[PDB]
Design a protein around this nucleic acid. Structure first.
Lengths: 239, 74, 159, 93, 258, 94
RNA sequence: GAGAGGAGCCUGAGAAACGGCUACUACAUCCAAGGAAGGGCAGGCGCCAAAUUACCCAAUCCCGACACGGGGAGGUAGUGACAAUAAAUACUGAUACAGGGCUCCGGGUCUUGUAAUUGGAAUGAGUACAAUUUAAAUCCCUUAACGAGGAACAAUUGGAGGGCAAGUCUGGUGCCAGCAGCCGCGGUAAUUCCCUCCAAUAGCGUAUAUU
């Protein structure tokens, strides 16, 4: 699929540090133009001439981690320092080795402030880098962030800004998918008001990622809830 | 309340051949190998092992065999 | 082969070693020394580099106590073997000087910091002890065998 | 305690400090705390707490001996106008 | 190359200074002044290396800037400008000085020396020629211009000035059969005694020298430096500047060792 | 196959998965599409358990031998980058 | 030695100075479309991924109204099984029971073992108060204190060989033989059951070129 590409999807995975996930989220937000606080779910970020990106916060539910493990274009693997690993990182890692191997997965490492000695930090860094090397790839790129630096996130940008190729995985070559950016609820006010629960029409709006859609009357799966049918397609134009 | 990772996870042994505590240390393994091959040379050839001990020759213990000629023709 | 396996098994059994790498190491240094003695024997006597160079080599091997101080000839330094070097090594001097009960106990009592050699304390059991420094092999001062504190098991025993 | 034997003293009349070698020992103790040693070079060569500069101070092998290269002034303004800045901020100045 | 730089290289640093091979790239290059590159000896190299009276340049500038050190009575608050030749350097408190001389090996050495013996200076005539006003004045080898001398005092005389106005109180005459330091050639920096002078129309007429123990060497007039007739003005260097052999002088050192 | 030491390949057909003997050479051999040469050579997967890991269409690295079908010549060493013995042991996933 | 590019120009002690002006030549950026400002090496990918986007002018040294102000020389550290070096993963007793252990068809030798019961010492990896080293940190050198009983503080890489079902598959003049067997009646908080030998050993295997 040689498309003039959509935003490449980057995952932020890790243990239940939610402050870690939104930490790196708002951190790379301040690397790009904005400075906003509250994260919407999928948030696209313009980078340079090849392809802009998009960023997401994987919740602590690993059903969503296997959903976005099916999605992920490139991977950011956010991991503790004084704790070793937790289970959810490994579950995502071989859940992704099973689902489909992306072109780029990167380790990135937090909580380096909570130490006592640079010998202990260096020993745990070499050990933990070795366990990423045996679980993931021989000589992968791991990273370190001590709590808001800018130079480390700058060369991090110099690694996720030189996108190579989203290596042709088969399912993502022949299956059409789209992560819903904007949630939109269209219902008649006597349908939503007179009936407490009947059904509601939902305009999910997003960027077409997969193979080409059906021009009329498509069946479509939505994660968790189930498979539904498209009542309508509109398309916002682009420059 | 963090999910601790277990030991096989940390060290992917997987399915390795079961090995010995004597094989764990190579110096112990060559120590237990030399003791056995010192033992087997007792069975084959004749070792000195001291002369008459304390008691002073209680006879030729472990028998005497009269037909046997254990010698190198020269 | 099998002559090397029984030979190096006899060396790793006579003297308490861990692998055959140290055997090959000792035979390598003996190959260099015996090689130098050979190529000094190529010249005649009264070749002054055989006199002074071979004289210096036999003085150095008398000094580190491998060649016995009685014999003073380069043929007698050609006639060496690896049990001289392993007989001069520190571990076997701990056992043959009776600080230890067995040779593996001697290597434990060397990696364990219990022995000193003169002023140093020596962790390496492959330490080529000099003949002059042979006498001063003894237990270290902070060890339980050279005075000092009685160590972990007796501390947890007193408590 | 600490044992104190000074080697190669020089009166150093050029700067009104003193080019001193001060060789100390702590046998059996942990290490010697050079600010407490700035409370030790006060009566032995008549210095106040400001004008005791100490550096070098490499402990010899196996505990015990410890070499120290020290410099005592005769005025704290000579300390400030003759002393380096990292030695000042390390020296609480 | 193509104009001046102030960076000195370290493998090419010459003999008189005793610089370390360590500590980064660059060495303390001397800048312009009285003398050339060779017989220069800065206060950087002098008070830090030759005397060990320094730790770093906070201390050395902290010595130099406070007006305690004098060079010919001048303050000389500069690090790159040189100290001269056969030098008089001041430690005026307790009344001592530093004459720089050669050793018996040919390199410079410090000497604590008195106020009188320091307060005169032995400076060679470089030139006696005609300038403005119609007078032949004297260009010294080291620093200054001695205007209105005695009119027959010519070149190659080495002058006892009193250092105070630059005026001749005595001179040592360029002569055959006289005692002279040599600063150049294959045998540079040696006290000897000249036996002859040769003319050599074609450049640099020379002297034959034959020392106390009959060793002959013929060196040029540009490097000869007549240091004394007998008249011990300056301090005597070690071993009378004879430069004997290392083995025999070594046996003399072991003989005179305490 | 003397210029390079390992050749990549596409697993084309698992030849003889319907055999009866569990560790016979019929069940062990696998048809391989060589990438640069274009030829089709069969190679020995060293176990039936490793044959359960050798899947269709996958990038598979092969090597030679050195010493039921004497004449099948190559050997499957990797499947999709991961080594096949490290897949046979429980070392790595794919 | 030659340097967006020809053509000219200016400064200074020293430059045909270009990371300085003036036109012309080839592109290209802000605009309210008249006008303006514009002319480097390093980084990543590349011709499925493996060496930091580190900290300092503290030393040594250089430059300026000049003790301060400035330094992409230099120093300090981080990764690294490509090598090269030293060597951990234990040491030592006591008793009890067993009678065979080993070696070449019949020989030859005399103490050997135990998933047997117990007792001792030894601690070094590591955890780490401190202090020190240092521009600051770290490593080092000191260093109080904790720090070993296997189910652990959890040595590997190769090869050779034995045993096995109410299992499976194949051959064939019953009961045999073959290849092989994580798969068996039940049972997964269900079960507690079978290994020996050789090699190198913090290193080892494999493929081709091969010598």
């Amino acid at each position: 699929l040689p498309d003039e590409p959509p935003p490449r999807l980057v995952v932020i995975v890790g243990p239940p540090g939610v402050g870690k996930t939104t930490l790196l989220k708002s951190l790379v937000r301040r690397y790009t133009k904005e400075t906003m606080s509250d994260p919407v779910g999928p948030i696209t970020v313009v980078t340079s001439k090849k392809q802009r990106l998009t960023f997401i916060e994987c919740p602590n539910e690993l059903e969503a981690m296997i959903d976005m493990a099916k999605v992920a274009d490139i991977v950011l693997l956010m991991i503790d320092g004084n704790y070793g690993f937790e289970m959810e990182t490994m579950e995502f890692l071989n859940i992704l080795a099973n689902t489909g191997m992306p072109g780029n997965v990167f380790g990135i490492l937090t909580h380096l402030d909570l130490f006592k000695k640079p010998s202990a930090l260096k020993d745990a860094k070499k050990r933990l880098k070795h366990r990423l090397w045996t679980e993931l790839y021989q000589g992968a790129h791991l990273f370190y962030l001590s709590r808001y630096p800018d130079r480390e996130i700058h060369n991090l940008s110099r690694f996720l800004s030189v996108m190579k190729n989203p290596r042709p995985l088969v399912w993502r070559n022949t299956h059409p998918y789209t992560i819903i950016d904007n949630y939109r609820d269209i219902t008649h006010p006597t349908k939503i008001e007179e009936d407490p629960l009947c059904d509601r029409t939902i305009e999910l709006s997003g960027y077409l990622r997969g193979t080409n859609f059906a021009a009329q009357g498509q069946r479509v799966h939505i994660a968790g809830v189930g498979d539904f049918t498209i009542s309508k397609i509109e398309e916002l134009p682009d420059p | 309340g963090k999910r601790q990772i277990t030991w096989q996870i940390q060290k992917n042994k997987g399915l390795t051949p079961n090995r010995k505590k004597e094989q764990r240390n190579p110096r112990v393994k060559k120590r237990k190998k030399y003791e056995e091959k010192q033992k087997k040379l007792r069975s084959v050839k004749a070792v000195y092992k001291g002369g008459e001990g304390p008691g002073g020759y209680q006879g030729e213990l472990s028998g005497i065999k009269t037909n046997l000629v254990k010698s190198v023709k020269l | 082969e099998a002559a090397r396996l029984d030979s190096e098994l006899k060396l790793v059994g006579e003297y308490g070693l861990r692998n055959k790498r140290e055997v090959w190491r000792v035979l390598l240094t003996l190959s260099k020394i015996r090689r130098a003695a050979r190529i000094l024997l190529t010249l005649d006597e009264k070749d002054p580099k055989r006199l002074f160079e071979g004289n210096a080599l036999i003085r150095r091997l008398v000094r580190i106590g491998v060649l016995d101080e009685s014999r003073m000839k380069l043929d007698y330094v050609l006639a060496l073997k690896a049990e001289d070097f392993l007989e001069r090594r520190l571990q076997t001097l701990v056992y043959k000087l009776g600080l230890a009960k067995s040779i593996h106990h001697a290597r434990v009592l060397i990696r364990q910091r219990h022995i000193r050699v003169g002023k140093q304390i020596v962790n390496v059991p492959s330490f080529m002890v000099r003949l002059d420094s042979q006498k001063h092999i003894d237990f270290a001062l902070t060890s339980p065998f050279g005075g000092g504190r009685p160590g972990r098991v007796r501390r947890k025993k007193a408590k | 305690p600490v044992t104190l034997r000074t080697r190669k003293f020089i009166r150093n009349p050029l700067l009104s400090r003193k080019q001193m070698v001060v060789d100390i020992l702590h046998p059996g103790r942990p290490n010697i705390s050079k600010d407490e040693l700035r409370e030790k070079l006060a009566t032995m060569y008549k210095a106040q707490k400001d004008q005791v500069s100490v550096f070098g101070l490499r402990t010899q092998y196996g505990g015990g001996k410890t070499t120290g290269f020290a410099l005592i002034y005769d005025s704290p303004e000579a300390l400030k106008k003759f002393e380096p800045r990292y030695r000042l901020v390390r020296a609480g100045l | 190359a193509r104009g001046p730089k102030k960076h000195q290289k370290r493998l090419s640093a010459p003999s008189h200074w005793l610089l370390d091979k360590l500590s980064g790239a660059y060495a303390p290059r001397p800048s312009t002044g009285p003398h050339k590159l060779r017989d220069c000896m800065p206060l950087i190299v002098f008070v830090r290396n030759r005397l060990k009276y320094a730790l770093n340049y906070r201390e050395t500038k902290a010595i130099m800037m406070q007006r305690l050190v004098k060079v010919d009575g001048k303050v000389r608050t500069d690090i790159t400008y040189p100290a001269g030749f056969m030098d008089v350097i001041t430690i005026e408190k307790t009344g001592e000085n530093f004459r720089l001389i050669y050793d018996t090996k040919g390199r410079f050495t410090v000497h604590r020396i008195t106020d009188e013996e320091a307060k005169y200076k032995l400076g060679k005539v470089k030139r006696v020629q005609l300038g403005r006003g119609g007078v032949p004045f004297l260009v010294t080898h080291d620093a200054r211009t001695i205007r209105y001398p005695d009119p027959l005092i010519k070149v190659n005389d080495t002058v006892k000035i009193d250092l105070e106005t630059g005026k001749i109180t005595d001179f040592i005459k360029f002569d055959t059969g006289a005692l002279a330091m040599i600063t150049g050639g294959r045998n540079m920096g040696r006290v000897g005694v000249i036996t002859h002078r040769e003319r050599h129309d074609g450049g640099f007429g020379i002297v034959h020298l034959k020392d106390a123990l009959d060793n002959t060497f013929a060196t040029r007039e540009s490097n000869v430096f007549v240091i004394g007739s007998e008249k011990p003005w300056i301090s005597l260097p070690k071993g009378k500047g004879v430069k004997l052999t290392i083995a025999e002088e070594r046996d003399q050192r072991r003989a005179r060792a305490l | 196959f003397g210029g390079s030491s390992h050749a990549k390949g596409i697993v084309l057909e698992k030849v003889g998965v319907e055999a009866k003997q569990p560790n016979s050479a019929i069940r062990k051999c696998v048809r391989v599409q060589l990438i640069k040469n274009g030829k089709k050579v069969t190679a020995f997967v060293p176990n039936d358990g490793c044959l359960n890991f050798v899947d269709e269409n996958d990038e598979v690295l092969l090597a030679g031998f050195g010493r039921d079908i004497p004449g099948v010549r190559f050997k499957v060493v990797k499947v999709s980058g991961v080594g096949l013995l490290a897949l046979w042991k429980e070392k790595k996933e794919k």
